[PDB]
Amino acid sequence: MIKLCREVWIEVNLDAVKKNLRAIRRHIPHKSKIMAVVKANGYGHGSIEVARHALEHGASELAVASVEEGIVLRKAGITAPILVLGFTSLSCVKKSAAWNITLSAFQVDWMKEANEILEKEASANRLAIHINVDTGMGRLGVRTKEELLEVVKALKASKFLRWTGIFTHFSTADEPDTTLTKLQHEKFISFLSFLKKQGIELPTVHMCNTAAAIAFPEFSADMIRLGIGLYGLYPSAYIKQLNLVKLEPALSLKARIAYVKTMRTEPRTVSYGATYIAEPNEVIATLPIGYADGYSRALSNRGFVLHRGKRVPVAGRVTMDMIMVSLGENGEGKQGDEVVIYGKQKGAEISVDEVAEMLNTINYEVVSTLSRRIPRFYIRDGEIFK
Amino acid sequence: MIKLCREVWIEVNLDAVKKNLRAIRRHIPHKSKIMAVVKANGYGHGSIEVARHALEHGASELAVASVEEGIVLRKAGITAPILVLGFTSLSCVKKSAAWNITLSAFQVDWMKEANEILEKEASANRLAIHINVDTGMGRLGVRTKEELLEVVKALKASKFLRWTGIFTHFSTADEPDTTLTKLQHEKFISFLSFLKKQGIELPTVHMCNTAAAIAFPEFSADMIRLGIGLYGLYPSAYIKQLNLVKLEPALSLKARIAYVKTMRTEPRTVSYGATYIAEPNEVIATLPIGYADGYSRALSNRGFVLHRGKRVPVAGRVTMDMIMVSLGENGEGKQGDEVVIYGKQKGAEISVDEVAEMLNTINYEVVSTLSRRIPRFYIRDGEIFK
Ligand SMILES: [Cl-]
Ligand SMILES: [Cl-]
């Protein structure tokens, strides 16, 4: 069924993804669109297959972190609009227009130089642009209404650029104190209305993320940007509280046992530093995953895996490519049994939220640091492919 | 010079890899060969170009973690012997014999069935095997002198296999207490003395890693396995202190500044959670690197980068694709300046070993978790390619 030389892999359930998008579509207003966020290799899930599926079941645009992530999607066949969320260098203006990637921009001088570059060539490639307004994130974007007016005029004069959006970003919308989130919203609404008093007509307006759309659905306007909710995970434990939308997690991680032995002979030391010594009756099983795959070294002598429906512990330090687990005295286990690292087995579970809690971080980082050297398999309609 | 859409990259200095190989050659006996370890994408440095250079300057063989990692090396034109250090499933016996990859084994029944697979397909190729003996690591390998002889017996009665090595691994050779290292050596030697009193001839013998080649060159036997020393990093502070061999680090990580602004209007909050609030004359700069690249989120409000030879601090939380740093009141900087994240700039340095200490791990983990969406550039005789 699954045949590998080194026996470790990931499974992505695409029937879960479709349900997560149903739930969201049926929460926000009917007049709002969905932009699916698939940067950082689909948050560790794989960007190509998730985008393809999301476009068939409710989304109409995509977002990525860089031009290079967008070009991978065009070569897979996708003709939908693609927006780049970070900052793009002027030396990629010609390539973005050629592949028809939408760029973010917020400076008067960037606009003119990008216009002159496409004018010194020709090509019916007009470059599409979204303007970023910084209302409190403090990362990228324009920050005063006088400055925004200068950028909008510099762009409306530029014959080879085309204005298709304006957005902002909320920095604390996953928290129970809503003070700063409403501040940001008032500031954005006033800037937009100042443009209206001057006779300027507005394109697509977007501002919400996963937490903003669950919590303040009346901020949806034209479009939202759905990210972490696409993959079946909640922005914060607090947003899980409200109990407004039901999501189902899409990823799990598995391996097969490589060797089993009893520690009868001496010495009975295990792994680097010899931080663990076994009984003469203890059974030790070896597994093919290590910290270079993204399984944190801080889980030395601390973590768990599921074998035959029960949790067994890591024994000794984590190494680059393998870990050892203890089956205890008596023992019971064979070369080739299936183990679950994240996910479910019978009626037991080790969830990604649990591991992130144990390591003092967030679920976002646990999934998106899973190495590309692990192969990905996709389930759709109960059957497996790649 | 370097031109990028998203402005972040790695530089790997092959002139430094060459000097590391020379220093090790002069310190060990002349009869002993060198096997270069490039598993896990060359400890994060890139496996292809580093293997090429190493075989041009002293190494005779290579080691990897899995059949798939060896296949990337053969596809780029490399014909040297390649040994898999982990466990390989019988699924890939026919494939390994076709791409001429050497595998480790230590079980009588695995030996028997591997021989059968290649028998029933005729096969002109003979699968090369190395036997792993477990003297104190507790990970994989054979444990008693009687059952090692059954395995030697079975491998010998197998016409489609070829015995080309026997080895073991030291579990504490980087520590001041040399008790256990002396004991494992003693056991390993009496096992081959046992085998030699039966008329059995021995193939290539190897036991040393980086640390045990430096502290005990009299253990070199036929061959050593040079891993972290090749990249210019010391296995421990204790081995670095003995001042026996001089290594030079190969890797640096850089980027360019995306945006600059003075926090004149309100609110002056910076990044998710609003964990840092700026001053109205403070200058804030935005860089394109994040925790999905492998820059740990635990460096939020804690780490540094180098700008114009100064250490400058991360402001607020690390995000998936970007960080923010503070230039101070009326600070000095321009959109496009060069920043150093790991490495040396003007008179300053942030070393990999410092970042590892700050996060309570070892230098192995820091380098081998740098993501593959970051491009690697190679420097040889002081100039650029790839
Ligand atoms: Cl932003
Ligand atoms: Cl081993």
Q: Residue A135 CA: which ligand is closest?
A: 1
Partners of residue B103 in chain A, C-beta under 8 Å: none
Q: From CA A329, how far away is CA A331, in angstroms rounded?
A: 5
B226 and B282 share a domain?
Answer: no
Q: Is B181 on the interface with A (CB under 8 A)?
A: no
In sequence order, what DSSP letters do the residues of B292-358 get, joined into one string? TTT--GGGTTT-EEEETTEEEEB-S---SS-EEEEEEET----TT-EEEEEEEETTEEE-HHHHHHH
Regarding whether B374 and B307 lie in a shared domain, the answer is: yes
Q: Tell how far the Cα of A332 is from the centroid of ligand 2, in angstroms.
A: 22
CB contact under 8 A, B292 and A369: yes
Ligand nearest to the CA of A141: 1
A259/B contact by beta carbon, under 8 A:
yes
Do B170 and B276 lie in a common domain? no
Ordered alpha helix ranges (H), chain B: 14-27, 39-43, 47-56, 67-75, 93-98, 108-120, 145-156, 179-196, 210-215, 237-241, 352-359, 363-368
Structure tokens at A106: 């917020």
- In the block, tokens 């994040």 appear at B290
Query: Is A36 inside a domain boundary?
Result: yes
Q: Which tokens in the block code for residue A284?
A: 């030790």
Instruction: Name which of A146, A134, A133 is nearest A194 in CA terms.
Output: A146
Asked if A334 contacts A260 with a C-beta cutoff of 8 angstroms, the reply is yes
Chain B nearest-CA distance from A86, in A, is: 8
- CA B250 to ligand 1 centroid distance, Å: 34
Please, which residues 14-43 of chain A have a Cβ atom closer than 8 Å to chain B? Answer: 39-41
| Residue carrying the six token digits 């190897």 | B206
Q: Decide if A302 touches B, using CB distance below 8 A.
A: no
Q: Tokens for B368? A: 């081998």
Domain range enclosing B332: 251-385
Query: Within this chain, do residues B286 and B187 fall inside the same structural domain, yes or no?
Result: no
User: Mind telling me the catalytic residues of A?
Assistant: 39, 272
Residue B375 contacts A where some CB pair is shorter than 8 Å: no
CB contact under 8 A, A139 and B65: no
Q: And the tokens for B138?
A: 């507790």
**Chain A interface includes B261 (CB < 8 A):** yes
CATH of the domain at B208: 3.20.20.10
Where does chain A show beta strands of DSSP type E? Answer: 8-13, 33-37, 61-64, 82-84, 103-105, 127-132, 161-167, 204-208, 223-226, 251-256, 259-262, 283-287, 304-307, 310-313, 323-328, 338-345, 348-350, 376-380, 383-385
Q: Answer yes or no: is B84 within a domain.
A: yes
| Contact call for A297 and B65, based on CB within 8 A | no
Contacts of B321 in chain A (CB under 8 A): 39-40, 65, 85-86
Scan for tokens 């036929």, then name that residue: B222
CB atoms within 10 A of CB B74: 14
Structural domain contains residue A25 = no
CB contact under 8 A, A7 and B89: yes
Does residue A166 sit in the same domain as residue A264? no
Residues of chain B in contact with residue A183, where contact means CB-CB under 8 angstroms, are 267
Whether A198 is in a domain gets the answer yes
The CATH number of residue B260's host domain is: 2.40.37.10
| Ligand 2 centroid to residue A309 C-alpha, Å | 28
In a domain, residue A196? The reply is: yes
Joined tokens for residue B350: 């942030």
Looking at the structure, tell me whether residues A183 and A224 fall in a common domain.
yes
| Amino acid (1-letter code) at residue B211 | A
Residues B61 and B155 in one domain: yes
Q: Catalytic residue at B39?
A: yes
A386 in Cβ contact with A377 (< 8 Å): yes
Cα dihedral sign, B158-B161-B164-B170: negative
- Determine whether the annotation assigns residue B137 to a binding site: no
Domain boundary among A176, A200, A231: A231
Q: Which of B88, B294, B321 faces A5 most closely, judged by CB atoms?
A: B88
Binding residues of A: 139, 320
* Cα B191 off chain centre by: 30
Q: What DSSP string runs through A142-174?
A: B--HHHHHHHHHHHHS-TTEEEEEEE---SSTT
Q: Is residue A242 part of a domain?
A: no
**Resolution limit in angstroms?**
2.3
Contact A102, A82 (CB under 8 A): yes
3-state DSSP percent of chain B in helix, strand and coil, to 5: 30, 25, 45
Residue from A382, A385, A379, A69 nearest A250 by CA: A379
Is B226:B316 a contact under the CB 8 Å cutoff?
no
Report which residue type is found at A57: H
B183 & B275 share domain? no
Evaluate the omega torsion of the peptide bond into residue A217 and state whether it is cis, within 30 degrees of 0: no
Number of Cβ atoms within 10 Å of the Cβ of B301: 13
* Inter-chain residue contact A171 with B274, CB threshold 8 Å: yes
B297 assigned to some structural domain: yes
**Same domain? A136 vs A273:** no
Distance from CA of B367 to the nearest CA of A (A): 9
Identify the residue whose tokens are 């020393």: B229
Q: Is B278 on the interface with A (CB under 8 A)?
A: yes
Neighbours of A237 (CB within 10 A): 10
Distance separating alpha carbons of residues B254 and B159, to the nearest angstrom: 54
A93/A109 Cα distance (integer angstroms): 14
B345 with B212, same domain: the answer is: no
DSSP letters for A193-215: HHHHHTT----EEEEE-HHHHHH
Q: How far is the CA of A234 from the centre of ligand 1 (A)?
A: 21
Length of chain A: 386
Report phi then psi at A262, rounded to 5: -105, 140
Q: How many domains does chain A have?
A: 2
| β-strand partners of A253 | A10, A342
Residues A64 and A181 in one domain: yes
Is the domain of A260 the same as that of A202?
Answer: no
With CA atoms as reference, report the closest residue to B249 among B369, B353, B376. Answer: B353
Q: Which of A216, A189, A213 is nearest to A202 (CA)?
A: A189
In terms of Cα–Cα distance, which of B43, B46, B23, B48 is closest to B34? B23
- With beta carbons less than 8 A apart as the criterion, state whether B209 and B174 touch: no
Q: At residue B211, what are phi and psi to the nearest 5 degrees?
A: -65, -40
User: Distance between alpha carbon B254 and the CA centroid of its chain, in Å?
Assistant: 20
Last residue of a domain, one of A179, A196, A231: A231
Q: Is the dihedral of CA B193, B195, B199, B203 positive or negative?
A: negative
For residue A323, CA distances in Å to A270, A300, B169 come to: 10, 9, 16
Bridge-based pairing of strands B205-208 and B161-167 is parallel
B194-221 residues labelled b (16+ CB within 10 A) or e (exposed): ebeeeeeeeebbbbbbbbbbbbbbebbb
Residues 6 or more apart from A174 whose CB is under 8 A from it?
A211, A235, A236, A238, A239
Cα→Cα distances B192→B108, B145, B200, B204, Å: 18, 9, 9, 12
Task: Name the DSSP class of A361.
Answer: S
In a domain, B240, yes or no: no
What are the residues whose beta carbons fall under 8 Å from the beta carbon of A342, sequence distance 6 or more? A251, A252, A253, A350, A351, A352, A355
Q: Do the Cβ atoms of B68 and A286 come within 8 Å?
A: no
Instruction: Show the 3-state SS of B284-307.
Output: EEEECCCCCCCCCHHHCCCCEEEE
A236 neighbourhood in chain B, CB within 8 Å: none
Rounded Cα gap, residues B215 and B173, in angstroms: 8
- Amino acid letter at A371? S
Catalytic pick from B75, B238, B272, B386? B272
Structure tokens at B65: 């973690």
- Give the DSSP letter of residue B202: P
Q: Do A138 and B284 touch (CB under 8 A)?
A: yes
Chain A CB within 8 Å of residue B365 CB: yes
C-alpha distances in Å from residue A87, one per residue of A92, A278, B33, B269, B342? 11, 54, 50, 20, 22
Short-list B102, B26, B36, B31, CA closest to B66: B102
A169, A201, A231 - which closes a domain: A231
